[PDB]
Amino acid sequence: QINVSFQFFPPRTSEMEQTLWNSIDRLSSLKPKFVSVTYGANSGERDRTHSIIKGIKDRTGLEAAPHLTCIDATPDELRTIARDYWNNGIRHIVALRGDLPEMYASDLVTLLKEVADFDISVAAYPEVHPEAKSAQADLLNLKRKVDAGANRAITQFFFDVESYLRFRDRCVSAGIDVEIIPGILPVSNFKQAKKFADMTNVRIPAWMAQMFDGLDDDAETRKLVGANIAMDMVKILSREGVKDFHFYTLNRAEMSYAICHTLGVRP
Amino acid sequence: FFHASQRDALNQSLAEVQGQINVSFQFFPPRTSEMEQTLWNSIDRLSSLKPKFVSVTYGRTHSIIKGIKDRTGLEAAPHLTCIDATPDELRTIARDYWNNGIRHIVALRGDLPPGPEMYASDLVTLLKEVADFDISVAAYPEVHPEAKSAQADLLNLKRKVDAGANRAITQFFFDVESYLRFRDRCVSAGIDVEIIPGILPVSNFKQAKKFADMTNVRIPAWMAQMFDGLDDDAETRKLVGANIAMDMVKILSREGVKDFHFYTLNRAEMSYAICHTLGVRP
């Protein structure tokens, strides 16, 4: 069947905290294989990420994976943190280098596997990481992370489906045998999605830009339009063999819940 | 891999139709104060899309038409049936409209009261003489329940067109292939009017399904499965329904359909969004 995972971020306000827990209760009913919580060095720190992870586990029993980065952290610190997480039931970590230099994501994967037999997920970039020397180098890096122990790759979001398909083919050609899980970003706020995409070199098709044109002050239409795009995307990916999806919920459940419904993932 | 590129091509072609598609909206006389307000709010919202025309069902209609015309200046076409009316009484009601600014009328026989020898074709002819109205009639891609056969039903539409109907609006449908095959059959039968698809954006499946079973409109298995389990989830139903309708008009648009009629159920949200995807914007 189809497996799904949901990504959340640490709330910074009382309002967002309420929204998040509402979304977790709603989405947990879909029995995701796992959920994850992002890390922001200047937007919550490791303690806030960990707190949310602990809260999810206690409230839902679901496997919750914290996103752990290695910037401004020492190897000894990372080992101590990893040991603590393991001994506390956290056995899946999304290993990342982090949004800013001594170590790269592959170094963290190796460090984590030395501590314990963690389930590890790493970032993949269908349209190439902005800092990569080349597409070839970025693919060789993903192979490096997988070879170090990563169990699966989760991709940066994309809106050009062929870009993901072509990337998946290159991964297979390179001998990367783990699942390349598409990270899906349901878009309700285009202005913000466009900003993020431009910063990560993610192409926004001309038809998509036109689809959101003139909707700056029409939230309702943006939601229906964005849901249509996301549902169409997962439909095509599903037809192309994708059996795993990771949703960038941005702490909202409505869109991701509905998209999962169309994939047959229901309570 | 082709599925991906085909979708991009479909989406891009849709983005390029911007400002070339005509749309019409259908409303019904409100039965409560809440609906009254909802209706006028929707008319204001939808009026900004500059529809070719809007229509009002008839089971107060005359009032609604005038109100819409005297408020937006849109071509408000009232619906007229052959129920509870005599061939002579349908004439006084017919010239009153022309002597009031109403030149477009949707001619139908009408739903039979729960409890005549005059059909819609007979009604169309009974209007052309009074005056040269713009007559729009109903077409049934999946065949009208009472029709003895598909061909017989098709010939009837032709009869209604030859009588003076300058356009046909279809019963709602969810099987796009059925509409396309029907559109082809119409041309083969010599019907030279466009067969405007009537689109019903579904938010309440339970109710839509009941209406469908009553009008002989088929609900595809994939659609039934798509709405299964959402009886108590209005939010998901709306996103799913919008997706279905948007996918429909997108496919229809690529097939050359440049005219759409929306059964708004007096709500603007869904139809407004579907129009947005078709490039119909304020």
Added chain:
Amino acid sequence: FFHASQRDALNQSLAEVQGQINVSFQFFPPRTSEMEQTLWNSIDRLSSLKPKFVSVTYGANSGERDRTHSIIKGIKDRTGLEAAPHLTCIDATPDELRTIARDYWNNGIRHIVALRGDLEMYASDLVTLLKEVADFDISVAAYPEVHPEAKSAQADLLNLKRKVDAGANRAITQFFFDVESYLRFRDRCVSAGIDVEIIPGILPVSNFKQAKKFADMTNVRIPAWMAQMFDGLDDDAETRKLVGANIAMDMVKILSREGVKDFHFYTLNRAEMSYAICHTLGVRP
């Protein structure tokens, strides 16, 4: 490598159709000494490709019928090719049209492109009138994207059927750049029971600014990618030529693979582009 493979397959198939494609060329009466010279140069160059026929337009409401007739005569005497004059009925009475038709027939002109003409009778009326005069080969216009004055796509399609039923044995389309529109229209013609081949009219574009204006007036869609391809080339005739040839070559390659074996070229009296496109279709001297 889907795209790469699809390309090699498309290219090889095109290479294999050599000696199976029929082509026709459309010219217009020269208005200057320079254009007169250009036209005859193009006629000699293109005649070497042995087209099934060539045609010469006649601007409706122009009153320059004699020019069209003169050019047609010149082509026949100079090349021995079948030359078809375009004839419009919007600017002539039935009697005048019958006289014009009879003279054509007696002058050995047995193929006429019957049109209503750019602004009482419609093209179908002209077709009927011509068949009554003599057993002419008659070609008529088809519109994949619907004629701008049609009350509906259905009405326009039934009109084509009327012209064919009246005696037209060839249908030539308005130019287009949306290949899928032509393919869908071809299927719709079958649904309407039209049994004549729908010959695509190909317009090789070198001057985009002018083609865009023409397309806008005729309801012909210019894809966004095409508008982008010509953006910034207003003063670069060389690049426009290469880009336009690429577009036309791609178009006929796809149409060829779909089974089209007849092409009508709107040459604008120039031979270079049409000659090269024909070369890719295996139509060579």
Added chain:
Amino acid sequence: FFHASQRDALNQSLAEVQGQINVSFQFFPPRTSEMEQTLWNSIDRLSSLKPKFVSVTYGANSGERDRTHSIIKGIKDRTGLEAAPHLTCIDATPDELRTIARDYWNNGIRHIVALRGDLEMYASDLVTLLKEVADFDISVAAYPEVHPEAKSAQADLLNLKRKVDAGANRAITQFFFDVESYLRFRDRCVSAGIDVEIIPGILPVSNFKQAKKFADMTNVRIPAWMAQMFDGLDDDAETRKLVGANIAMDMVKILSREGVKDFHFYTLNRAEMSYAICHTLGVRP
């Protein structure tokens, strides 16, 4: 309508890459006054496209090193663009090469295309020698269809790896017409652990007779459809240009869709074709 849809998708994607493609142009030392003039005209025309760099060949065993150096200097002073001289080691001793390298570096030449050269040391030896002289940007040749003298495809691939490991930061391919061969080679480079981008060398063909001879000598395959496309055009330069442009435009469109964002053009000192191909890639003045 698979082929039609695939075309529209490919074309729209190409339109959307505008402002994301990097290009470079290769020239050769003019041998006559006419060619000298042609070259500078091409350099001015192409420089307006802001290429990442341009390069100038040096025929091994020619003894005309000065010409290459002179042209490079002229380009830098006239355009301010990065100009890379090609340097071969088959006709010079290590000491001579070190002197040549030092002078380039002191003259502001920081990018060299290091080659063994057309017939003791191999290109990898030159790469190592250059890096020892200074921190040069070094580009080397790659062969998707395997260099004719290689003992095996594996040996040739490992040789590219050796050159990259020695300090080369760019790989530029021999020209090709079999797009799938390049794509497969690109994947094989990843398998070999080569992390530099493999830049496709594009040869826009106008004179097929000459390109065929060159291809035959370099082991580059000419597809049967391509040979057929140029058949019968020996004395038709106009049609050859249109056909060749069509081929190159189709090639970069497919490569672009596959993620290639860097292209190196073998201009043969002419600007027209390369300029137009760049225009389709969104590289415009």
